[PDB]
């Protein structure tokens, strides 16, 4: 049961992110802190694979031009992520902050408008600090913008 | 672990055959032997290398072409997985990238500005590792010539 998993983790650089593996090919996610705290995304098509017993890999590309490849080892409460940010997302991360689904064309208009190279690459580990299977296609799991303290509320059950 | 120094050849399920040499904890060389971009070879590519668990590793990086790569290797299981994020133009005009990159880095940069980037062409595949020899560290000769038809066999055999 890896699909359906709902995790919160904290990258070694202090960023706190939340992902929900909704399908074998779809995720939702929320960013709670860091350069781009506030951003949240739903129905992001993704490549999900099992690499071995215990290890998984969720990778995809964004309407922003950002390319992501996450590896999860939940048994070990650990994961690794590498994010390839187009220059402009580093310069102007605030553009990307919103509920993406409502403004997809904005992200596309933006990645053409602003500069792409050199990319800003963030490769970090993270500690998983929450893991609850919510079953498959559970649309309510990630359904509101993040707010200060939300991660605690989730972890507390509150 | 004793993963640095490794020299592997593998074949992606889409039929592409590639060759990598893990030269350092932060550097690779590589050769592409078939597929859309057969002929391409690269040296001293800075990379992010990590151990994720016992047996599993991850080499990821970005190219002067704009291509972003994240490879996972599980050598014990003679298997690996790769995802490659190609800028549109590399899919349209892969021949540009077919080069000893080091001699023409600025070409790649001039190109990724000149041509279109979006939508990207994403290739996420498994591959079977068909060769694995540790060649120790900073062995500069391991990958030192452009690939030729049959080269992978020659390596696997002995020449
Ligand atoms: O959770 C991750 O691994 C990456 C999250 C992310 C959120 C917004 C971005 O613009 C890029 C990455
Ligand atoms: O898997 C590898 O070792 C290299 C892949 C690759 C894909 C596109 C390129 O333009 C160069 C290398």
Swiss-Prot record, chain B:
pH dependence: Optimum pH is 5.0.
Location of the active site: 18 (proton donor), 63 (proton acceptor)
Catalyzed reactions per annotation: (E)-4-coumarate + H(+) = 4-vinylphenol + CO2; (E)-cinnamate + H(+) = styrene + CO2; (E)-ferulate + H(+) = 2-methoxy-4-vinylphenol + CO2
EC numbers, comma separated: 4.1.1.102
Traits of the deletion mutant: No longer metabolizes ferulic acid.
One annotated GO molecular function: carboxy-lyase activity
Leading EC class: lyase
Keyword entries, A-Z: Aromatic hydrocarbons catabolism, Decarboxylase, Detoxification, Lyase
Effect of residue 67 to V: 52% decarboxylation of ferulic acid
UniProt superkingdom: Bacteria
Pfam families attached to this UniProt entry: PA_decarbox
Effect of residue 63 to A: No ferulic acid decarboxylation
Reported temperature dependence: Optimum temperature is 40-45 degrees Celsius.
Residues that bind substrate: 10, 12, 40
Swiss-Prot/TrEMBL GO biological process terms: catabolic process; response to toxic substance
Cited function: Involved in the decarboxylation and detoxification of phenolic derivatives. It is able to catalyze the decarboxylation of ferulic, p-coumaric and caffeic acids.
UniProt subunit comment: Homodimer.
Family classification: Belongs to the PadC family.
Name of the protein in question: Phenolic acid decarboxylase PadC
Organism of provenance: Bacillus subtilis (strain 168)
Lineage, highest ranks first: Bacteria, Bacillati, Bacillota, Bacilli, Bacillales
